[PDB]
Amino acid sequence: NNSLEQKAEQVLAPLRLSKEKLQDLSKTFSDELLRGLEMHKRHGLKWVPEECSLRMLDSCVSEIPTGNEKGVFYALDFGGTNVRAVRCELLGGGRIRSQQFLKNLYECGGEIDLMARETSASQLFDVLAGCVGELVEENNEKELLKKKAAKLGFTFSFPCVQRSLNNSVLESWTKGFATGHDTDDPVVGKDVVPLLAAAFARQGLGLECEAVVNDTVGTLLSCAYQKGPGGPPCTVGVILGTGANCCYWEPQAAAFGYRGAVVNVECGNFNKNLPTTPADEAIDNKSPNKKHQLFEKMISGFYLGELVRLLTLEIFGAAAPAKAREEFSFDAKQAAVLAASLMPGKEEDPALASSCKVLLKESWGWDLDAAALKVMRQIGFAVFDRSAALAAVSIAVLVQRTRSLETDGGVTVAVDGSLYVRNEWYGLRIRTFLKELLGEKVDKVFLRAADDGSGKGAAICVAALH
Template sequence: MGGKLVFGVAIGVAVAACAVAAVVVGRRVERRSKWKRVLRILEELEAACDTPVKRLRQVVDAMAVEMHAGLASEGGSKLKMILTYVDNLPNGSEKGTFYALDLGGTNFRVLRVHLGGQRSLSLKHDVEMQPIPQNLMTGTREDLFDFIASSLKEFVEKANDPDQLAARRRELGFTFSFPVKQTSASSGALIKWTKGFSIENMVGRDAAESLQQAIDRIGLDMRVSVLINDTVGTLAVGHYQDPDTVAAVIIGTGTNACYLERTDAIIKCQGIFTTFGRMAINMEWGNFWSSHLPRTTYDVDLDADSPNPNEQGFEKMISGMYLGDIVRRVILKISQESDVFGPASTLLSMPFKLRTPLMAAMHEDSSLELTEVARILEDILEITDIPLKVRKLVAKICDIVTRRAARLAAAGIVGILKKIGRDGTSGIAGGRSRTNIKLKRTVVAIEGGLYTSYTMFREYLHEALVEILGEEIALHVILKPTDDGSGIGAALLAASYSSYDTVSVDKSL
């Protein structure tokens, strides 16, 4: 009897052990199955974001074709190819003190730049920032510009201005970062307000003239000599520092590009005259689109949820405004199909909760345990106790999204070079033959934190540039970081468009 009891207990223990083992094995199988689903999502993302050099060259060709179409007729392309009428870029010989006003959001800046007649990588300048009261953003144009002009006058009166002693009228460059229909280098009508402004009696009016009238009302002896956007300002800074600068790109929160085009290639404005046979063209390249762009379901959803669906497609794939949110959307997808991120975090469903600077910090986390990845996931998204392999997964997602963005930006830049015959080919209609082509030193000025502050983005962009152009051609293309095109660039253009004989013109392309 006792033996039977012992035997029965042994059997029971064995059965229980088997049951426990089955549960353990079952859980392991389930975890492996969930992890396989996670890896499948990652593999699908990587495949959808793939940018082999063949595809990048297709994007290059598409960019060049769209540029050509945008120059041929208004509305002929997703690229607006806006005429700026700026044809006289600063060349380093400018002398004097010049001012700039940078208005592009809820703050504005005023600057004073001192030029000594020689090129310099570091210009002596003074700057002040002033917030715009909320009521002025929805009031009248007179109230807004009177406030700005008063602040400008106070800024001018704080310092000794040598041009005042020389009985020279002060000159100012105005960076107005809103949609404008440019009519000359110093005039342009506002098309619509953005960024929280809604002053009705300003739409359709000349922004530079409105500022000039306010300046005149308060008795400040100053002329608004040029009206630009920030990308043209970046081109001006680049050309001031290096005469071989032919284009400028901003890759920051937003993105845009401009470049120097021959006036005889601007078909939509036949008969236009410029002193030097060229003009800066504001591409508004954020709106570029092509079927060759590697679009994912995350891009489609982001676009559908945005305030401007079906617009700014290129910008939504490469600019700092959106990269962090693409990564958030991928993490959200994984969290919905597995529990590798633990209990569901409601913060993961909040658009733009993960900003691009934080994404970049996770991507560039070089610690063995990826402690920065863990900290950001916990602090920003309230995702805690993440194992190392999941932290590595997040870093990989950041890498995939960033690499695609940087390589597409590189293709955009080469597209500009192709349009103006600086990519080592025969131009827009040519193939990739490089025989008998004289290679010119070609400088592209670049501004924006995504390029200047994000090392991995910058390295991926340079890598793609060499892949697309080839090593021999790439040696002649220099990407040169610049700073403060919207401020210093505007002052430099005020100098190059000065009504006084203190500058010499630059007739080189």
């Protein structure tokens, strides 16, 4: 204590980004976005990191829903071992009724590891197609779809090369997958849409995959449909969860060589003029993706707990608890408990502070005193508030680029992700920083929660084509 507060001040001040620092970062990010569009115009599918840290991927999505579309549309959500099939009744007026069927690929296939190098593409896609087929059968719909096929959107959350809305080639596996590597039937290097269509045909399923949809773009589309007809257009989509990403509607997309209008920025990798602190350097240095995802490493839930832990070690020194020396011993949910205790008009609320005391005892075995508890709360607040401020920078830059404020007098920003969904104050802090960045015209910016981009959003994508 006593000089604990001076040390906390010295360590935490670089995390408190002033309006001027946020405005400078916004300018840097805007310039980088333009560099990325010029990069796309010249290089197309080839990312040139030396020209731009933002991939600026063509989502190939051009048709934004009105909210009036009606019908039954399907989606397949394959982003790892937890596969989902989704069926959406679009009822008009922004209303959607959904069903889902879940498959855990670890427990699928008899004496066959679907993630293994010896498994063929056909075996994996048979299981994916069968997930959708189980949902079709729950609805007693197989014969109806034999008569008239249903449209399906495919969220395939792996590194891909996407030449058109319905053509996406797997560039390399991630997330522990190796399927097909040791077979004559690979997934890597193949367009996944014909693999899925072949699997549907083998099971007699009348589903036509018309889009491979990025989940951030799906979040934008989910919002666009479900806010209903009318209102300021949804031209920005943001995911603030375990990771962080954003997409937006680009008014000069055609001139820069895009087929779609919605650009998937891949802003997690933004790396220009970042307000780096020693804790950020430590997080990057021990990560498996050094010098990549540097913006995300300051924003997203995967890292906020690590930031609190490393700043705790830095500030408390020999007074830090032993468990704070263990990587990933403190997560973003726990950091949020700390940050919530210091949100506007809650600082002297005793119940929130008491939850903090219990938290630190349970997670770190730390029976700390009043002054130490106050400093821990300040650490958690500083980490989460910086996350909100940097998210606000991303949103403001994208809103400016859409020109929606100028052409439609308002903009709807679709937001999803655990940081925003779990913490009511997080979006409010985003709005405070958006006011700092944009002035009074933040009153024309509407943040709207948007659900299930990877499922609902992909079904909406294909519904908007017709």
